């Protein structure tokens, strides 16, 4: 009953099971630990970062090793459009003979790989199960390096100080230039040297790379300035990927669009992209001042940025010390940027597939988009939660105020009511009218008169599609016109490739849109606005409100303030995160439902099914869920089973976890404490069991813990059931 | 505030004509989101001068037939801009540069919240001594004449645009400018 929460003496003195539960959930909140200083905080965070990167590299190495050992990578190379990639083998003693037979792939039961790693590794120039093994070996070596570094930087003479950790200019210069630019430069080097010849049949391994010229002229044009030579003779339109037939000699080109065979971006396009990004980031990494008297001091930049007329208060004067001294502000900024970035990855890796033969891998396309959108929602909610935490525990009004006037951040708490009221107005506006139009379509179609539907053509979005060259909406605007200056300017660089790809019905590049797209985009906007409303309200109201003008004194996460003053359930800022998680899950569900139904109709060919039935709710319920759930639920029946049996089991498992979350959310404490007391009496008053007694007094889960557990069940069930549905439906419908 | 500013005359009684009270919205709620009366008056002078110049530039070339030698002979203001933009790109570029320089030197951005060293449409610019030595009432009367002529030119240019868009919107227009 002691010594487990070593970091908290208050918990270690708890005589109940709450100590164990809270010991888990407070282990990473280093700022709240006993005998805590800032130096130890930054050093522990640094070591934890090292361990985390080691974990990531070990996970990647495991994926590589299992593809190399139990996969069919080599067979998939020779026939990427017919051979289904294998993730890893299965050894489960609970299998019957039927399950073994159904999951049997080649030599052993195995799982199909939906991560798209086969296409990614094939694109970057891997052709052998020994290339994957080398990658796994190297990644385990890197993990060992990172673990050694993490141990080393906790040693006495190697523990960095607060000044080093808060040295913003040095870290920015190095991160930008070194990390981004130099990693892009090295990736361009690999892309060219290995990937470009490997796509043309020439093997460039760790033996013949110092003697195989990536370009026939060989670094002469680069120093000579004849950089056009690297773009001459690109890959033809009859080039077979991985073979020298119809190949070229160029390494950096503009082509635009996709490879005619793999239906993916040109490797020479991506090498040029990464070279340009490398140059730009290396240049941008010299901005801030270091030991050589030139550069920028960001404190001065922030302080000097006050509009002269005066509408942002005193400007950004106090922001430098605010961000530097708070790890939650930086964490929130990083999480918001990462969420936007992974939303970008999801939205671009389906419209512009970058890996060979990934466009025809429909289950992996759906899985990748869903995975990245869910990660995006999680990251955004985390960014807002950490902003709220910064408000609660790191924000100092004195730093952000100069002689009564407030800086740009402190002024966000002055018109907080205006911000929240207008977020509420936008949410109500969008919800009222999107639901009104959807229900109008529902009722009108149900009454057998679909012509009375309200169908709004998304002209604004179709205008953008025409601006990028789509000649489908008869707009003749910028790139849909051959005479506009936008078209004449790039008529010789990348329009022929771009136009040939955007004006193609088999791509996902700028999918044609209609009224259903309009309505679902408005639903998405409503979801985004409502999630933002909850999170922003929790962040701004974190330090106090009218119901609790001292909420900052109770911390970020506390159960309530009691039944007084009318009742104060879910009044903390943590509860705002807890409520906004449901809205994030709902919004990501809407986004992924829209994406998956649109792409299922596109792949099956019945795009008229979406364009007609997507305007009313029953259309969704009947033609997406009810229609495509048939292959999934018949993964095992009283007659047999298929390789989709695991997905049906996961479907039911997700439903069960969802409803257990419903348990933990609807039923609150107090009802579970008295029942536990009855159980305690029963155990204490029964023979043959009195010999065994608990060391920690069994008590009901706390209010905040119960909310967390219900949210965890809700989210896990949500994710599992939707993953099972999307994967099984795609597999069982599209062969 | 409008009682002590140039712009009102016998045509609208003796009071400043302001049906919508737009001159008094600057002092209303907000630090500044709606223009001050000084910004509105500078917009008056600028729009009126531009409208007078544009009326001359649609009347003289289009009707009288006077044209700069190496410029397109297009008696139509809806195409003359593009025609000269292609025919003499350097001339249009120099005109744009001169306009930008003139406006940047005479910047009116502190007029939005009220204030600044300049007056409403001061601009210096008295070459031929028309206001060399005059009574204050005479200068005010000349300013009022300028403002009223600018408003009239605004109305004339709006009428041009309306008749081009909606035919028959100005009945006497084609009988008062017989050529395009």
């Amino acid at each position: 009953v002691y010594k487990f929460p070593k970091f908290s003496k208050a918990l270690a003195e708890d005589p109940s099971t709450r100590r164990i539960w809270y010991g888990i959930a407070t282990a990473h909140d280093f700022e709240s630990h006993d005998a805590m200083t800032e130096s130890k905080l930054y050093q522990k965070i640094f070591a934890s970062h090292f361990g985390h990167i080691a974990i990531i590299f070990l996970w990647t190495a495991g994926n590589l090793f299992h593809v190399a050992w139990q996969g069919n990578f080599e067979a998939w190379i020779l026939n990427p459009l017919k051979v289904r990639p294998i993730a890893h083998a299965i050894w489960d003693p609970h299998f019957g003979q039927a399950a073994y037979k159904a999951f049997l792939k080649t030599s052993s039961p195995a799982n199909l790989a939906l991560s798209g790693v086969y296409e990614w590794w094939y694109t970057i120039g891997m052709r052998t199960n020994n290339d994957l093994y080398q990658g796994s070996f190297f990644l385990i070596l890197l993990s060992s390096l990172l673990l050694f570094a993490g141990w080393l930087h906790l040693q006495p003479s190697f523990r960095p100080s607060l000044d080093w950790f808060k040295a913003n200019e040095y870290r920015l210069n190095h991160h930008l230039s070194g990390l981004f630019g130099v990693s892009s430069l090295a990736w361009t080097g690999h892309l060219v040297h290995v990937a470009i010849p490997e796509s043309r049949g020439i093997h460039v391994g760790w033996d013949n790379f110092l003697t195989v010229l990536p370009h026939p002229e060989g670094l002469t044009p680069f120093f000579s300035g004849n950089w056009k030579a690297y773009a001459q003779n690109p890959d033809t339109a009859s080039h077979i990927f991985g073979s020298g037939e119809g190949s070229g000699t160029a390494i950096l080109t503009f082509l635009g669009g996709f490879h005619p065979q793999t239906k993916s971006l040109w490797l020479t396009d991506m090498a040029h992209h990464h070279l340009a990004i490398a140059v730009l980031f290396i240049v941008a990494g010299h901005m801030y001042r270091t030991n050589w008297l030139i550069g920028h001091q960001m404190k001065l930049i922030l302080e000097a940025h006050r509009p002269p007329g005066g509408r942002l208060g005193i400007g950004h004067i106090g922001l430098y010390e605010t961000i530097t001294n708070s790890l939650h502000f930086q964490l929130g900024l990083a999480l918001a940027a990462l969420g936007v970035a992974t939303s970008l990855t999801a939205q671009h890796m389906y419209a512009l597939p970058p890996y060979a033969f990934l466009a025809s891998n429909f289950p992996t396309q759906a899985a990748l988009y869903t995975h990245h959108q869910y990660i995006a929602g999680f990251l955004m909610v985390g960014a807002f939660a950490h902003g709220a935490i910064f408000f609660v525990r790191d924000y100092d009004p004195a730093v952000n105020t100069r002689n009564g006037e407030k800086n740009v951040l402190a002024r966000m708490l002055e018109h907080k009511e205006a911000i929240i009221s207008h977020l509420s107005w936008v949410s109500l506006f969008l919800g009222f009218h999107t639901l009104g139009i959807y229900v109008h379509n529902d009722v009108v179609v149900a009454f057998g008169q679909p012509e009375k539907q309200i169908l709004v053509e998304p002209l604004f979005a179709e205008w953008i599609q025409a601006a990028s060259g789509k000649t489908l909406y008869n707009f003749d605007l910028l790139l849909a016109s051959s005479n506009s200056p936008a078209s004449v300017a790039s008529s010789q660089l990348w329009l022929p490739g771009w136009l040939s790809a955007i004006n193609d019905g088999k791509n996902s590049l700028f999918l044609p849109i209609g009224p259903g797209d309009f309505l679902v985009h408005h639903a998405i906007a409503l979801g985004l606005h409502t999630t933002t409303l909850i999170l922003v309200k929790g962040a701004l109201d974190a330090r106090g409100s009218k119901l609790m003008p001292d909420k900052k004194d109770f911390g970020y996460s506390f159960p309530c303030d009691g039944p007084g003053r009318g009742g104060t359930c879910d009044i903390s800022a943590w509860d705002a995160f807890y409520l906004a998680m449901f809205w994030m899950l709902n919004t990501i569900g809407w986004v992924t439902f829209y994406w998956h139904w649109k792409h299922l109709t596109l792949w099956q060919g019945n795009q008229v099914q979406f364009n007609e039935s997507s305007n009313y709710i029953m259309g969704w319920l009947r033609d997406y869920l009810w229609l495509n759930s048939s292959p999934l639920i018949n993964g095992y029946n009283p007659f047999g089973m298929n390789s989709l049996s695991v997905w049906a089991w996961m479907f039911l498992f997700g439903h069960l976890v969802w409803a257990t979350g419903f348990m933990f959310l609807i039923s609150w404490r107090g009802y579970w404490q008295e029942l536990i007391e009855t159980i305690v009496w029963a155990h204490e008053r029964t023979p043959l069991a009195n010999l065994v007694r608990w060391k920690d007094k069994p008590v009901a889960l706390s209010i905040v813990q119960a909310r967390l557990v219900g949210l965890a069940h809700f989210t896990i069930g949500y994710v599992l059931t939707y993953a099972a549905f999307v994967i099984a439906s795609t597999i069982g419908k599209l062969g | 505030g409008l009682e002590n500013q140039v712009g009102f005359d016998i045509e609208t009684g003796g009071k400043p004509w302001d049906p919508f009270g737009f001159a008094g919205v600057s002092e209303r709620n907000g630090l500044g989101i709606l223009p001050h009366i000084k910004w509105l008056q500078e917009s008056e002078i600028k729009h009126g001068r531009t409208a007078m110049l544009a009326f001359l530039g649609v009347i003289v070339p289009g009707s009288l037939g006077i044209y700069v030698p190496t410029y397109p002979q297009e008696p139509d203001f809806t195409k003359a801009f593009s025609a000269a933009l292609q025919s003499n790109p350097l001339g249009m570029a120099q005109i744009a540069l001169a306009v930008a320089i003139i406006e940047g030197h005479y910047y009116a951005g502190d007029f939005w919240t009220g204030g600044g060293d300049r007056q409403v449409g001061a601009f210096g610019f008295d070459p031929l001594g028309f206001s060399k030595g005059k009574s204050e009432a005479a200068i005010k009367s000349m300013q009022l004449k300028e403002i009223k002529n600018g408003r009239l030119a605004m109305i004339a240019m709006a009428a041009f645009a309306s008749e081009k868009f909606i035919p028959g919107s100005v009945p006497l227009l084609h009988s008062a400018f017989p050529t395009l």
Partner: protein
């Protein structure tokens, strides 16, 4: 809800139906209760998914009000 689900499925599968002139009994669903009501996947598929076909396909018919109330009750 479980009681009424049991009643509906059991009656439709093992009581209700039509009788042929020679005495052959054919039920509404066909006796699937005995073998497919013993798993949760069976309840999900052979009862909920299977018998929800009439509700979702009621649009445009005289039972469309039932589909509308289905959606509204979900809401």
């Amino acid at each position: 809800s479980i009681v009424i689900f049991h009643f509906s499925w059991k009656m439709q599968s093992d009581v209700w139906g039509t009788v042929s002139p020679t005495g052959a009994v054919s039920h509404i669903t066909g006796g699937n209760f005995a073998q497919s009501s013993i798993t949760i996947n069976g309840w999900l598929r052979d009862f909920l998914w299977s018998q929800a076909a009439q509700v979702v396909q009621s649009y445009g018919s005289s039972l469309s009000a039932y589909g509308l109330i289905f959606l509204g009750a979900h809401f």
